[PDB]
Amino acid sequence: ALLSFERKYRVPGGTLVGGNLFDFWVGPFYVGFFGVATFFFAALGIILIAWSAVLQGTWNPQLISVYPPALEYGLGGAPLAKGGLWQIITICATGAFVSWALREVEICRKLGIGYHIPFAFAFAILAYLTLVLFRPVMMGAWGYAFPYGIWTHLDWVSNTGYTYGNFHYNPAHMIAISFFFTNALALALHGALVLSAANPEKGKEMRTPDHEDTFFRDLVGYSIGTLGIHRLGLLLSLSAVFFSALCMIITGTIWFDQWVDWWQWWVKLPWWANIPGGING
Amino acid sequence: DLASLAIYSFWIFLAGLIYYLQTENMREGYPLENEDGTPAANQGPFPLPKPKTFILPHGRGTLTVPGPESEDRPIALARTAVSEGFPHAPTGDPMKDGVGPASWVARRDLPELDGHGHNKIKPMKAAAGFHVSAGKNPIGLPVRGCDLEIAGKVVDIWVDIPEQMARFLEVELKDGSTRLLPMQMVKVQSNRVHVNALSSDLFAGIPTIKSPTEVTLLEEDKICGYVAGGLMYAAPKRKS
Amino acid sequence: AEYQNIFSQVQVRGPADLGMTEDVNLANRSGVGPFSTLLGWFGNAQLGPIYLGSLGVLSLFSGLMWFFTIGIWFWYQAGWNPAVFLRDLFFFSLEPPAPEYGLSFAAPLKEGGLWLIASFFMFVAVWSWWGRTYLRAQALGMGKHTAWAFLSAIWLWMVLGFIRPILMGSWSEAVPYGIFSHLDWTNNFSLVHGNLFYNPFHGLSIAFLYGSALLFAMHGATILAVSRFGGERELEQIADRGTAAERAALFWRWTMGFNWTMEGIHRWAIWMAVLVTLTGGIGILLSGTVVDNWYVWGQNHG
Numbered sequence: 072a073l074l075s076f077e078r079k080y081r082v083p084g085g086t087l088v089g090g091n092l093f094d095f096w097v098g099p100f101y102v103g104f105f106g107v108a109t110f111f112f113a114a115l116g117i118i119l120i121a122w123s124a125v126l127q128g129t130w131n132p133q134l135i136s137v138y139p140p141a142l143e144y145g146l147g148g149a150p151l152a153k154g155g156l157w158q159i160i161t162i163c164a165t166g167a168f169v170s171w172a173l174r175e176v177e178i179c180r181k182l183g184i185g186y187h188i189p190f191a192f193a194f195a196i197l198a199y200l201t202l203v204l205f206r207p208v209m210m211g212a213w214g215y216a217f218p219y220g221i222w223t224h225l226d227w228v229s230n231t232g233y234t235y236g237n238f239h240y241n242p243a244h245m246i247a248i249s250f251f252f253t254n255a256l257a258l259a260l261h262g263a264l265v266l267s268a269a270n271p272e273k274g275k276e277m278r279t280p281d282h283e284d285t286f287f288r289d290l291v292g293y294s295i296g297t298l299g300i301h302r303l304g305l306l307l308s309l310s311a312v313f314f315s316a317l318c319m320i321i322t323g324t325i326w327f328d329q330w331v332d333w334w335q336w337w338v339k340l341p342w343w344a345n346i347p348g349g350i351n352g
Numbered sequence: 353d354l355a356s357l358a359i360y361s362f363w364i365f366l367a368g369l370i371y372y373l374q375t376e377n378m379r380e381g382y383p384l385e386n387e388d389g390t391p392a393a394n395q396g397p398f399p400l401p402k403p404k405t406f407i408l409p410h411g412r413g414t415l416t417v418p419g420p421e422s423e424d425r426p427i428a429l430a431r432t433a434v435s436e437g438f439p440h441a442p443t444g445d446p447m448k449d450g451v452g453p454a455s456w457v458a459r460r461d462l463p464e465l466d467g468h469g470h471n472k473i474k475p476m477k478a479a480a481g482f483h484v485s486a487g488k489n490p491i492g493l494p495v496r497g498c499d500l501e502i503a504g505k506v507v508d509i510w511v512d513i514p515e516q517m518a519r520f521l522e523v524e525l526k527d528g529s530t531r532l533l534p535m536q537m538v539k540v541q542s543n544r545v546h547v548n549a550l551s552s553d554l555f556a557g558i559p560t561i562k563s564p565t566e567v568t569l570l571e572e573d574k575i576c577g578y579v580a581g582g583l584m585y586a587a588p589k590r591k592s
Numbered sequence: 593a594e595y596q597n598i599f600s601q602v603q604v605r606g607p608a609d610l611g612m613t614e615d616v617n618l619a620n621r622s623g624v625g626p627f628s629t630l631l632g633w634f635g636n637a638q639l640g641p642i643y644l645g646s647l648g649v650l651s652l653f654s655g656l657m658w659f660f661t662i663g664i665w666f667w668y669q670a671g672w673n674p675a676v677f678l679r680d681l682f683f684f685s686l687e688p689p690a691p692e693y694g695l696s697f698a699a700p701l702k703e704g705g706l707w708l709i710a711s712f713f714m715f716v717a718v719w720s721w722w723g724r725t726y727l728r729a730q731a732l733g734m735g736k737h738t739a740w741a742f743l744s745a746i747w748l749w750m751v752l753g754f755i756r757p758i759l760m761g762s763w764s765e766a767v768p769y770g771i772f773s774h775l776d777w778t779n780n781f782s783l784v785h786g787n788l789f790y791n792p793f794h795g796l797s798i799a800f801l802y803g804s805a806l807l808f809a810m811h812g813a814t815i816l817a818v819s820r821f822g823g824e825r826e827l828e829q830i831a832d833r834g835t836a837a838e839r840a841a842l843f844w845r846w847t848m849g850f851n852w853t854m855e856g857i858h859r860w861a862i863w864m865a866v867l868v869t870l871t872g873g874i875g876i877l878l879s880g881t882v883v884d885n886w887y888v889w890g891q892n893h894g
């Protein structure tokens with residue numbers, strides 16, 4: 072049950088709520104008050120999904136789907152079988168995610184480490200909340216939220232996107248994408264660079280960080296460095312999600328026409344708007 | 353059809369890959385132990401990977417992992433409960449004893465070296481051509497602890513040569529001795545250096561280095577462990 | 593508040609670092625470039641030196657030619673007018689030859705020949721760049737992880753512009769060189785193959801793309817959180833585990849029971865990213881060649 076070096080770290084303290092009451096582990100897992108809260112919220116949410124499944128009449132995971140209320144309920148409460156279960160499940164999910172984050176904070180404190188992890192996870196929670204809470208409230212109905220189902224949530228992505236034509240034209244979405252792709256590129260380079268230094272040509276000695284900086288300066292003329300690459304991966308990933316949330320929050324609220332038509336602002340600038348030829352002349 | 357063949361073959365690849373990844377991540381820390389240091393009965397679903405050996409640069413030898421694990425230091429803690437899974441309380445002063453968030457590992461008592469075999473980290477007074485290129489130069493500033501009392505003054509910056517970075521501040525205390533502070537644990541202000549993790553009376557307990565111009569990997573761990581430990585243990589003395 | 597180590601508080605500079613030598617031909621290295629204080633707040637301040645070499649020159653020349661060939665076409669579509677070139681920059685497109693010309697190289701220039709030329713230059717630029725990534729590591733005695741990971745990205749690019757088109761029997765199937773037009777192409781590709789959300793390789797590819805952001809966020813954050821114990825000196829943490837590596841391991845162990853080592857997390861990193869384009873390339877390759885319609889295929893599974 073313990074790693075060979077673990078015992079010295081398993082000391083009392085660092086909890087945010089409850090003193091010593093939940094200051095313990097189960098196997099490898101730390102509990103804390105937030106571990107208890109996450110378990111509660113999760114078990115309740117799962118139970119409600121199971122209940123939704125009986126109402127729908129299927130136990131098949133690929134068919135189970137919990138839908139938000141139809142648009143006619145606006146932002147009010149809805150009957151359980153027609154959106155109410157989705158509303159409660161959403162509260163439970165939010166409770167579980169937030170609890171997971173705070174439990175991470177308790178672990179960080181016990182260990183004496185920075186809070187960067189829970190802080191980063193908060194960006195994922197914000198994206199989820201954007202889709203199920205902020206956007207729907209701004210648009211005036213819970214029904215604009217996505218359904219909980221394997222394939223049905225993809226049906227929602229497809230239908231929501233094609234409501235605005237080709238969603239590729241949302242400018243914030245282009246930025247979000249660029250960050251996602253750039254993040255993956257940087258992750259591959261980081262993993263590969265470290266490994267290539269730790270596992271050199273057969274029979275050679277382990278390389279040093281000086282070789283990592285040299286490899287990149289030889290290749291592209293610049294090395295961000297061993298500290299900088301970690302700062303970069305954090306920023307790229309968070310920026311990707313930040314722009315994701317932004318691209319959705321503005322869709323159906325400040326902009327509700329076809330995203331391709333937004334670009335007309337640029338082609339209709341007086342200075343070249345009537346100049347003939349090209350594609351738009 | 354072919355697509356079906358492709359997806360099934362891909363899942364088999366993936367299961368093999370995950371198995372590989374999991375076992376690679378068991379090269380340190382295993383086998384698992386009971387709280388008393390004996391081998392646990394249940395080691396989990398994956399077997400320990402075959403040992404790999406790293407050849408270290410500059411004639412420092414080899415490292416073979418997984419291999420015999422040992423703390424190689426006294427651990428001043430005691431059980432607080434009669435069953436498994438509860439916290440272990442410090443039996444003395446957790447900062448002095450190096451337990452909890454004040455922990456340190458028995459790394460080699462040698463300095464990390466750069467790609468040429470020279471000491472990676474050195475006091476800026478010995479690093480030819482190095483200087484502060486941007487931001488506030490902390491040298492000469494008073495150092496303030498979380499109790500808002502002045503504990504000393506900065507007398508140098510210890511720099512990573514190959515990576516051109518500030519790694520520690522050398523701080524002189526009231527008795528004229530010095531100590532290293534990790535740059536990631538200080539806040540450089542216009543008229544001072546603020547240290548949230550420690551109160552003024554704890555600066556003298558920061559572990560000392562044996563040679564004035566180099567720091568070993570062991571020393572860095574003791575120093576950094578100690579400082580970070582003050583976040584939990586200096587607490588009574590922190591005010592704001 | 594506490595310092596978070598996102599930006600450096602103090603920069604320090606010394607003599608320009610000329611780097612490791614190992615088996616590198618130093619005649620082919622440039623001199624050092626300027627130091628950027630701007631960059632130095634986040635990463636290393638030093639610019640250069642860079643390695644030139646034959647492959648580098650070939651790759652840069654081919655690359656510039658690919659780019660200029662497209663640029664020439666845009667100027668022509670703009671009727672040589674700078675105001676129209678800027679206004680319509682995103683709308684211009686250099687399209688592959690029409691389906692009529694099959695896989696032939698006969699197609700007239702305004703009808704696809706220019707696309708073929710630009711593609712030729714791109715082909716040379718990328719593959720020579722690949723050779724460079726392999727040789728720069730070999731000269732330093734490093735493992736070839738970088739070149740092998742790059743090959744995964746090349747796989748998707750090759751499938752899109754070369755392999756799928758050849759197997760379909762025509763260049764018309766390839767991607768056009770344009771900002772908006774390659775987006776339109778992407779949308780059309782999914783519509784034509786019965787919705788790519790039903791292609792299992794596409795779903796896997798998305799899981800790895802998302803998982804790459806999850807992992808870099810975790811990893812980036814973890815190393816910053818243990819940077820107070822020298823955690824970003826990953827190589828020496830691998831050779832001689834310190835409290836940074838122990839604390840990182842324990843964070844993940846206590847949070848979700850995950851096995852973690854300093855070297856091991858980099859293996860997760862390389863594979864998470866590489867699987868994005870590996871799986872994606874397979875998914876695209878099978879589209880139209882073997883599977884005409886993913887919805888139909890999904891209903892049956894064959």
Ligand code: BCL
Pocket residue numbers: 239244245246248249250252253256749752767771772774775778
């Ligand atoms: C995967 C399915 C589609 C596809 C779907 C999308 C979607 C959907 C989107 C993009 C986006 C982009 N795609 Mg595309 N893309 C495909 C294949 C490619 C290929 C290729 C060689 O195979 C290239 C070069 C591009 C290029 C690009 C960039 C224009 C843009 C940002 C990419 C990025 O962040 O890279 C990160 C990598 C780097 C660190 C280096 C590259 C730097 C960028 C800026 C490239 C510059 C060179 C040049 C192409 C740009 C010219 C502009 C100025 C005149 C210089 N795509 C395939 C065909 N792509 C986003 C965009 O904004 O479109 C407008 C977007 O929303």
Ligand code: BCL
Pocket residue numbers: 168195196197198199201202227228229231232233237238239244247248251312314315316318319778
């Ligand atoms: C036909 C569909 C349209 C389209 C319509 C949409 C729509 C509609 C949306 C996007 C959104 C996105 N699209 Mg788009 N998009 C299209 C084509 C593309 C292409 C492409 C190559 O063509 C790409 C690369 C993208 C890329 C992207 C990303 C920018 C973004 C999704 C990531 C995100 O939000 O994560 C954010 C991450 C999360 C929400 C995860 C939250 C996780 C939480 C906090 C924790 C979960 C825990 C869980 C329960 C686990 C517990 C289980 C354990 C077992 C216990 N789109 C086409 C043109 N796109 C989405 C977006 O921006 O959302 C904000 C969005 O809603």
Ligand code: BCL
Pocket residue numbers: 117120199202217221222224225228789794795796798799800802803806
């Ligand atoms: C992000 C923007 C869109 C969106 C667009 C898409 C698209 C497009 C696709 C997915 C795909 C998936 N999405 Mg989705 N998805 C959204 C919001 C979510 C949320 C959420 C709570 O916010 C969840 C939990 C998921 C979950 C999932 C997985 C079923 C699947 C693989 C994701 C993955 O590996 O991520 C990276 C994370 C990891 C690798 C870590 C492991 C995560 C595990 C695998 C998640 C399991 C969740 C479980 C099935 C549900 C709850 C379990 C119990 C009820 C407790 N999506 C929003 C609406 N999602 C892909 C798929 O194949 O769908 C069929 C796909 O093509």
Ligand code: BCL
Pocket residue numbers: 228252255718745746748749777778779780781782787788789793794797798799801868869871872873875876
């Ligand atoms: C309407 C649009 C369709 C759709 C159509 C497609 C199509 C078509 C494709 C994808 C592909 C992908 N899509 Mg999809 N997709 C949709 C909806 C989504 C959604 C979503 C939330 O709804 C998401 C998250 C995704 C996500 C993804 C990615 C997982 C995947 C691209 C991987 C990649 O890194 O490529 C970017 C990386 C590369 C292109 C490799 C480039 C490598 C080369 C070597 C670079 C050369 C650089 C060059 C020289 C320029 C240098 C310039 C610099 C200045 C130097 N899609 C909808 C359903 N999608 C691809 C795929 O793999 O599908 C299986 C693809 O082909």
Ligand SMILES: CC[C@H]1c2cc3[nH]c4c(c3C)C(=O)[C@H](C(=O)OC)c4c3nc(cc4[nH]c(cc(n2)[C@@H]1C)c(C(C)=O)c4C)[C@@H](C)[C@@H]3CCC(=O)OC/C=C(\C)CCC[C@@H](C)CCC[C@@H](C)CCCC(C)C
Pocket residue numbers: 252253255256259260263290291651652655656659717718719721722725738739741742743744745865866867868869
């Ligand atoms: C494993 C998957 C991910 C991945 C990995 C990956 N990519 C890689 C690598 C790896 C491991 C490398 O080693 C290699 C590299 O060297 O990076 C530093 C590479 C690389 N991936 C690149 C881009 C790239 N990778 C991408 C994707 C991905 N790469 C995946 C997400 C994408 C997209 C579309 O998402 C792009 C755009 C290059 C930075 C680099 C390969 C460089 C190369 O082949 O150069 C060949 C040609 C030239 C020298 C071109 C010169 C022409 C340009 C300099 C100028 C263009 C004209 C300009 C003046 C204006 C026009 C430009 C735009 C504004 C239009």
Ligand SMILES: CC[C@H]1c2cc3[nH]c4c(c3C)C(=O)[C@H](C(=O)OC)c4c3nc(cc4[nH]c(cc(n2)[C@@H]1C)c(C(C)=O)c4C)[C@@H](C)[C@@H]3CCC(=O)OC/C=C(\C)CCC[C@H](C)CCC[C@H](C)CCCC(C)C
Pocket residue numbers: 109112113114116117160163164167168171175188189191192194195218219220221224308309312802803805806809810813847848
């Ligand atoms: C912000 C950048 C990216 C990011 C970062 C990130 N994610 C994180 C973290 C970080 C830094 C963590 O520390 C935390 C973690 O511990 O990782 C191991 C986490 C994590 N990210 C996860 C998943 C995840 N992250 C995702 C995305 C991202 N995470 C970003 C792209 C995605 C997707 C879809 O892209 C997923 C699926 C978890 C593995 C883990 C958080 C685990 C957790 O919250 O546990 C508490 C909750 C439960 C045990 C289950 C609750 C059950 C509910 C009550 C009911 C189910 C409701 C649900 C809404 C149904 C949805 C059905 C779908 C089919 C739609």
Ligand SMILES: COC(C)(C)C(=O)C/C=C(\C)CC/C=C(\C)CC/C=C(\C)CCCC/C(C)=C/CC[C@H](C)CC/C=C(\C)CCC=C(C)C
Pocket residue numbers: 659660662663664666667708711712714715749750751752753754767768769770771774
């Ligand atoms: C300022 O003006 C001047 C003229 C100076 C300029 O230089 C400006 C130039 C610009 C306006 C240039 C703009 C360029 C872009 C908009 C480019 C955009 C490119 C993309 C979006 C590309 C996307 C996808 C590309 C793909 C997948 C290409 C694949 C290529 C291949 C796999 C190559 C296949 C090889 C072929 C078919 C020929 C092979 C022949 C043999 C003999 C082997």
Ligand SMILES: [Cl-]
Pocket residue numbers: 810811812814815840857
């Ligand atoms: Cl990590």
Ligand SMILES: [Fe+2]
Pocket residue numbers: 261265301811815826
């Ligand atoms: Fe790392």
